[PDB]
Amino acid sequence: MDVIGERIKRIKEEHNSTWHYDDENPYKTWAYHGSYEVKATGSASSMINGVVKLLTKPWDVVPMVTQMAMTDTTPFGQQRVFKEKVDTRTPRPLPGTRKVMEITAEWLWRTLGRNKRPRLCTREEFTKKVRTNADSAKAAVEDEEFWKLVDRERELHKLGKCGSCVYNMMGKREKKLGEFGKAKGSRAIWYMWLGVRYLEFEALGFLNEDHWFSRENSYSGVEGEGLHKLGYILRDISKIPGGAMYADDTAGWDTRITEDDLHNEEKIIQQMDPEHRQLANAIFKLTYQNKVVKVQRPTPTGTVMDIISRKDQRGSGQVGTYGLNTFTNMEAQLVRQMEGEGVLTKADLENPHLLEKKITQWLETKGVERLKRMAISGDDCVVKPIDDRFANALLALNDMGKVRKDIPQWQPSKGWHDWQQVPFCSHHFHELIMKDGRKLVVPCRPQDELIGRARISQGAGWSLRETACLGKAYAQMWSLMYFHRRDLRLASNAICSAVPVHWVPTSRTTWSIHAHHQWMTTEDMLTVWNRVWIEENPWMEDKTPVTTWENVPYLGKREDQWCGSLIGLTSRATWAQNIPTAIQQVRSLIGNEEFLDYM
Numbered sequence: 032m033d034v035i036g037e038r039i040k041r042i043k044e045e046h047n048s049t050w051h052y053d054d055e056n057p058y059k060t061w062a063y064h065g066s067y068e069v070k071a072t073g074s075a076s077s078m079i080n081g082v083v084k085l086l087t088k089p090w091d092v093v094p095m096v097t098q099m100a101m102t103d104t105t106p107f108g109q110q111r112v113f114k115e116k117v118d119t120r121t122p123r124p125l126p127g128t129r130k131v132m133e134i135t136a137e138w139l140w141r142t143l144g145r146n147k148r149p150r151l152c153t154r155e156e157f158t159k160k161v162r163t164n165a166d167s168a169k170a171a172v173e174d175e176e177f178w179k180l181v182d183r184e185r186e187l188h189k190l191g192k193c194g195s196c197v198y199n200m201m202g203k204r205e206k207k208l209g210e211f212g213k214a215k216g217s218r219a220i221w222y223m224w225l226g227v228r229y230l231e232f233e234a235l236g237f238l239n240e241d242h243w244f245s246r247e248n249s250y251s252g253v254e255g256e257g258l259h260k261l262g263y264i265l266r267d268i269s270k271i272p273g274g275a276m277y278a279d280d281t282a283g284w285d286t287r288i289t290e291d292d293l294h295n296e297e298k299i300i301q302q303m304d305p306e307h308r309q310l311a312n313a314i315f316k317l318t319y320q321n322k323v324v325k326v327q328r329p330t331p332t333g334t335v336m337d338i339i340s341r342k343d344q345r346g347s348g349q350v351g352t353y354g355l356n357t358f359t360n361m362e363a364q365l366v367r368q369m370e371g372e373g374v375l376t377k378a379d380l381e382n383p384h385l386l387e388k389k390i391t392q393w394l395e396t397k398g399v400e401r402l403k404r405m406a407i408s409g410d411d412c413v414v415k416p417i418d419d420r421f422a423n424a425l426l427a428l429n430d431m432g433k434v435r436k437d438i439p440q441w442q443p444s445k446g447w448h449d450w451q452q453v454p455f456c457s458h459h460f461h462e463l464i465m466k467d468g469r470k471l472v473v474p475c476r477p478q479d480e481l482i483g484r485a486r487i488s489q490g491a492g493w494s495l496r497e498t499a500c501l502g503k504a505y506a507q508m509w510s511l512m513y514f515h516r517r518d519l520r521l522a523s524n525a526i527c528s529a530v531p532v533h534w535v536p537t538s539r540t541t542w543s544i545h546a547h548h549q550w551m552t553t554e555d556m557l558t559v560w561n562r563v564w565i566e567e568n569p570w571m572e573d574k575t576p577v578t579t580w581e582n583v584p585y586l587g588k589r590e591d592q593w594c595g596s597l598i599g600l601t602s603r604a605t606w607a608q609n610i611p612t613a614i615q616q617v618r619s620l621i622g623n624e625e626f627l628d629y630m
């Protein structure tokens with residue numbers, strides 16, 4: 032209570048008129064502190080992009096397409112996700128498991144910091160990020176009072192105290208664009224949250240800003256590679272002699288981050304300068320190893336905001352989440368590789384006094400080589416161990432809390448002998464042969480997921496221009512990343528013919544760190560395609576440009592169909608034949624603008 036008390040005291044004082052202890056609060060593993068009356072945020076479903084929907088009529092039926100728009104962010108949805116996923120306790124790992132993890136984490140941070148030194152991130156760096164991604168964040172960073180509030184909170188952090196770094200589980204709250212932009216104490220709430228984000232970015236942002244998890248720095252990492260490079264990396268891993276390629280999914284990774292993992296992640300502060308270490312130690316102790324969280328809850332008499340806390344799990348919407356998840360997953364997979372190799376036994380995991388020297392010997396002689404066999408991005412991993420003993424090496428993985436999703440905990444993992452079947456970052460990758468004989472390695476995922484996502488707009492209250500510009504952003508992302516899917520190349524051509532040529536793509540198609548957003552432009556898509564797949568592609572030795580889309584390949588028809596294509600169906604042939612009519616209908620509603628025919 033001495034670490035979280037001031038944050039709760041300030042909340043309690045600000046909402047003194049309705050603050051109460053609700054005896055029928057549902058929290059079982061989070062400490063519950065109190066509630067106050069609040070207006071309900073979120074919406075029961077996502078708004079549909081009318082431009083994309085009109086140009087993808089055969090997918091109006093398709094069940095996965097309908098499900099993608101059913102995300103519920105109201106208090107009911109906030110509580111549903113909370114109860115089904117976040118309100119659990121991860122059993123403490125055994126003493127031998129804790130020892131191996133500690134040894135591996137120390138070796139791993141030392142390896143990651145061999146060339147780079149941690150540093151503080153700055154006000155202008157944060158401001159520049161906000162401005163390049165643009166707006167309430169831009170208004171906040173241009174207000175001197177926002178930075179003065181940041182300074183006061185930093186002075187508390189230097190004293191080992193925290194007053195306003197409270198995270199929340201509400202995500203995007205507005206039901207219509209600008210709903211809270213001019214509301215009562217919205218500015219103060221936003222300044223405190225964005226200020227907390229700034230302080231975290233100041234102390235831990237170096238991990239992302241200085242590419243600590245780049246493949247060159249981390250061996251296993253893929254930070255800064257891009258979706259268009261991930262397949263090539265899996266193809267390169269497939270050439271390393273060894274067993275099958277394993278890609279186990281953890282059930283709710285962020286909820287399985289234990290107090291032991293947090294204490295191993297904190298070890299990076301040992302490489303910092305005294306002034307940086309003091310600020311990063313405040314972030315770790317005050318907001319990672321202790322956290323104060325707001326979440327809404329429906330009650331018989333309306334909505335309340337509950338104030339809860341806990342000492343483990345990975346927080347809601349944090350700067351260091353991706354990098355720290357990548358670190359801990361690299362460590363966990365090295366531990367699993369040691370178990371597969373016979374370095375760690377079941378008796379060792381139970382033993383606090385296990386032989387530290389055999390772990391150090393394996394890390395010092397094989398560690399880097401074993402990191403090179405992996406592609407790790409947050410909770411996503413691909414591992415090609417030295418043989419298949421790894422498939423049944425589950426003692427440490429389960430004991431560290433990283434229980435695999437939807438599989439009995441002692442059933443052996445299933446690995447893949449074809450890198451093209453390996454799931455990684457919600458995709459799988461194909462090697463395609465171009466008409467000229469050159470090979471491409473492309474990203475792919477179930478087509479219903481791509482169409483379903485593209486049919487969701489920024490939200491209610493956005494103009495037809497902003498909606499059409501987001502539709503154009505999805506169409507152009509398809510032209511650059513998923514051109515090999517017949518239906519997507521056709522729909523992309525339809526959308527780009529329906530939206531005025533000089534309207535610039537707005538919003539974002541995804542928040543994924545692997546998206547480099549090369550499609551966020553009004554440049555010719557074939558020119559951008561050549562830049563990404565030919566000119567800048569390090570795995571393309573022959574730089575001969577492709578002069579027509581007729582020479583940009585597709586997946587084989589059978590694979591396109593296995594992966595969701597409607598090619599071959601009557602409704603799809605009817606759609607393809609009558610698409611100029613739907614394009615014209617969109618153009619008529621947009622108005623007298625300059626359009627280009629891409630069909």
Ligand SMILES: CCCCN(Cc1ccc(-c2ccccc2-c2nnn[nH]2)cc1)C(=O)N1CCN(C(=O)C(C)(c2ccccc2)c2ccccc2)[C@@H](C(=O)O)C1
Pocket residue numbers: 069070071072166167168169199202203204205209210211212213217218220221325
């Ligand atoms: C200048 C005043 C700005 C008042 N404000 C803040 C805010 C919103 C709702 C509430 C709120 C209302 C009622 C009851 C309780 C609370 C409350 N209680 N505690 N925390 N929330 C309070 C603060 C606001 O208008 N926003 C907030 C940010 N939003 C975003 O969509 C978005 C994508 C964004 C990114 C970049 C640049 C700009 C925006 C973003 C989402 C989530 C996390 C980060 C960034 C909109 C939203 O989430 O509604 C609009």
Ligand SMILES: [Zn+2]
Pocket residue numbers: 184188192193194195196227317
């Ligand atoms: Zn704070």
Ligand SMILES: [Zn+2]
Pocket residue numbers: 459461475476590594
């Ligand atoms: Zn595919």
